[model samples]
Target: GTLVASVLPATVFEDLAYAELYSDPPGLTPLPEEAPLIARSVAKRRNEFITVRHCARIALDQLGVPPAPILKGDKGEPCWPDGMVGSLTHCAGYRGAVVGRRDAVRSVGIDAEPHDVLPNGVLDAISLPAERADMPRTMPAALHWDRILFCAKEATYKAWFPLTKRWLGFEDAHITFETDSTGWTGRFVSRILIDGSTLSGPPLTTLRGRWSVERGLVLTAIVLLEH
Candidate 1:
């Protein structure tokens, strides 16, 4: 299990400062210069990126790191200074970040999505061929498992890349997901192909993810490596 940290549940992180950023109205965080120009328009779906940045800044503040100096990396990923590691994700209604000392949490990724129906075609785009072929004919249609699987791959990439400083695609690894009394869990079935580089470490066996829905929003969290 991981020691999850957030700016919410006010009573829990009371001593943390950046908790206030979550309470701020959106669009308050300054946009980066390299961010796409179209990203500024209200019509763009990425203003939420700025809000996420705000939340990252706030989390850094609580961690005793100065906000203005910290910025997103080249790929728009959170850039934590030496000795700290963390990631952020947000959906239509909520934004949150998970951060802690490098010695505390090896790596982490968090993501959120509105609990909206995904078109079959969109889901098909991200599906692995083997997974598609193996889908049980008896599988129920009520479970929106495919979309969660897709997001889990993305969340997996984000959490892993920062440490490896390498890129991995959706198909780089296989995913097995299930939902039950403990919530949803997506486990990777193969070694993550980290570009062309090889690793001395054991092939990452799984990324433990948990999901839930509240007020029509779907949220997911992936706790990277084990302690």
Candidate 2:
């Protein structure tokens, strides 16, 4: 099984907690000189990213890769040096990362968002008319399921791209779900064949996951095995 990393609720980083960075070195290096203003501006962003990096690195180390700095790709994807897998996520005040090896991983995706209403335009753009009508009829705008749906689409893409190396847009994917007393699952649906154009491969068959709120953020992750 893939190891999981989770941030506890209500545990946001305060400047006070950040102050300890000054004394850390063997754990984390000191800020380089000649970069005070730039460093100050990047502190918060760096903090959030580091929180995720450290968590993922811990998991990677446990799997025998040893922690190291993550490199980045043009799409903001993290580059794992030793041919490992990685994903990055950040919400209003929470952040996370997950990592695994080629065979050790089937496919993985995680998403996080603050527990607030999504802007109407965000939903309107990605949702189908039928889904829009039905979801609100069941869930009301105040709930986070809409955001979860939005995230599920993204997670599905992230999980699929590493395997297929394909580019998919929000409108290119549709998500549906099923549930029982035990838990729920979401599936990814897509059939993008704009007239005169053709798909490079088969449509993504299925994606599954459970979602919930933690640390004032909605978080979800799922693994879709590559066939």
Candidate 3:
């Protein structure tokens, strides 16, 4: 419990009144409607589906909702219950879910990835051209900033799609990072370039998030606290 939870700082959850669950060294717990969706996949894919949904189940329950099958939107977004909002993440040896009340927390996004470089060309595709140009000269070379940016993009998408009901292209958000002396943990800011969601908040101009790297894994979270 503590091992998986430690992947994120307490502020990621504590500040937002979010309920979080994580499973490491994971195993499946049967969640019926969720299974057939992943049934035809290979074992790793299938197991990850189960493990993450398992985390979701308890996270939702912990948020005071009666346990029920979580639905998937047309784009495979997790359809959380009324008055509740959250996001999910899974990576090698880790699966996590975070939930919070809608009245207080507008949305939340979470993601995790191994601490390694992305495959060639991915950094260019996911990062802003200017980000690629400036990052290397200013930031530490060993922290795998590209991977962290990708993870932040993933988290941003999870946070963006639910409210906008549209796609957030990799180029839509510009990301920058700030790391403490430890180099193992830091924070980031995502500047949204295009017009964003309506009724969701003020314009989708910017989002702030935190990052953590440990045990060979890197995690990032964006908590859009309610206005």
Candidate 4:
């Protein structure tokens, strides 16, 4: 409830539902629900898993769901309870999770990354040719928009998988970000460039998200509401 509860939650959601982001270790013990999976994992993976589940439990509690085991998907996406949807993220020193009821939310996703320039050639791997050329001309130059673009893709992927229960490659979405005069925070739109075919409901053309670079981290969250 220190930085994430105050700083990043409102930037993502219009109404404060349930979000938890941790800069320090959650210091959580593994639970029986996921103990078997934990036993086969490395120490670092084990810790991140425990921390995300811990975040999930708390947020789910506030969202009117009781303590339920969060599992995994065929695509390694975190599984939620009966009527809930959520996403989890962890990178280096940051861990975060957000949850919402499927009754109101179609899906949700969040991600965090170190707020620095991406290494050489990495910018090419994740970006479309037009984005590479167009972004520089539109957005401010001083900030590292590449990493934010990557972060938004990860978030959009997280939000997309649950809806379609299929794959959405980074190349499948043309991600674009826009910032205010401050150049530190803004919103993103991922225009999905899939063939003219619906997955479960309809062909998703776009997914909107929010982004912020602060405290040495770039944080992003995408919410696809039911309405």
What do the candidate models score in CA lDDT, each in turn? 0.55, 0.52, 0.75, 0.76
lDDT of 2 by residue, 42-91 (tens): 66565555556655666577567765666655465666756566566765
lDDT of 3 by residue, 48-116 (tens): 777777777777777678878887875998988888888888887678787877876787888988888
Q: What is candidate 1's CA lDDT for residue 130?
A: 69
TM-score for each candidate, following the candidate numbering = 0.69, 0.67, 0.87, 0.89
Model 4 lDDT tens row, 12-116 = 353335545554465577778777777889888898788777888888887778887887767787778888888888887777777877777777888888888
- Most accurate candidate by TM-score: 4
List where candidate 3 sits over 4 angstroms from the true fold. 2-29
Off by over 4 Å in 4: 2-16, 21-27, 196-199
The TM-score measured for candidate 3 stands at 0.87
Q: Any runs in candidate 2 off by more than 4 Å, and if so which?
A: 1-41, 134-142, 180-203
After superposition on all C-alphas, the RMSD of every candidate to the true structure, in Å, is: 5.7, 8.5, 2.8, 2.6
lDDT-better candidate, 1 vs 3 = 3
- Which residue pairs in candidate 2 have backbone atoms (N, alpha carbon, C) closer than 3 angstroms, thus clashing? none
Higher-lDDT candidate of 2 and 4:
4
Model 1: how far is 191 from its true place, Å? 5.6
lDDT of 3 at 39: 68
- Runs off by more than 4 Å, candidate 1: 1-47, 130-141, 182-205
- lDDT of candidate 4 at residue 182, scale 0 to 100: 78
